[PDB]
Structure 1
């Protein structure tokens, strides 16, 4: 029921609001394969990423209409919901471009 619209290599991180530092998403340092999935039936999108090594799901979050997606640098992009701040430290500029293109697309069609 969902179609992948991109795959990008990134170290997924969340911001620890109490210690003022980034920490690895899911508790595990290393790179993940991060998709945006489009549920075509209802036109919704989510980010799902899984560690390359062991397949652990480290991010699974909805992309809401109006999201402010911040391209802080050419290889680190970030966004937030009401509870967490998410960061993607991409493995290359090409990966950042792939993901940002798909995200900017999702945000235009929502």
Structure 2
């Protein structure tokens, strides 16, 4: 309900065997990327926040990650962002700078809301 922070269609990007490049994970197809909160117990107390990417054609979950307060966000272009949570990285190729900005507020609110509870 008020559990979702953002939902956009984008292409999931993974860091390549090269050194500093990014490529789309598998297909070049769009995925349904959402950011959401999952209550530990009480619907309004402490919770965990996840980023989830589901490929549109075969509904395969190609990305699933738990947000953490220390996470780093990187706006490279107005249409390409990538983040680092602990040791690994994921990135997104948005369809518009709009979607990108909407998603960014989303992740931002979610991160700030992480300690809501204790």
What TM-score do you get using the length of structure 2 for normalisation?
0.81
Query: 5+ unaligned residues in a row in structure 1: which ranges?
Result: none
In the alignment of these two chains, the number of paired residues is 108
Q: Is the 8 A contact 1:15 1:85 kept in 2?
A: yes
What TM-score do you get using the length of structure 1 for normalisation?
0.86
Q: Is the 8 A contact 2:79 2:96 kept in 1?
A: yes
Shift of 1:44: 1.3
CA separation in 2, counterparts of 1:91 and 1:68?
A: 22
Shift of 1:67: 1.1
- Residue 37 of structure 1 is matched in structure 2 by 36
- Residue 94 of structure 2 is matched in structure 1 by 90
Q: Is the 8 A contact 2:7 2:35 kept in 1?
A: yes
Pairwise CA RMSD:
2.0
Query: 5+ unaligned residues in a row in structure 2: which ranges?
Result: 41-45
Cα deviation code 1:5-24 (max 9, x no counterpart): 211111101102x3233232
Tell me which stretches of 4 or more aligned residues in structure 1 moved more than 4 Å.
Answer: none
Greater mean deviation of Cα atoms: 2-11 or 28-37:
2-11
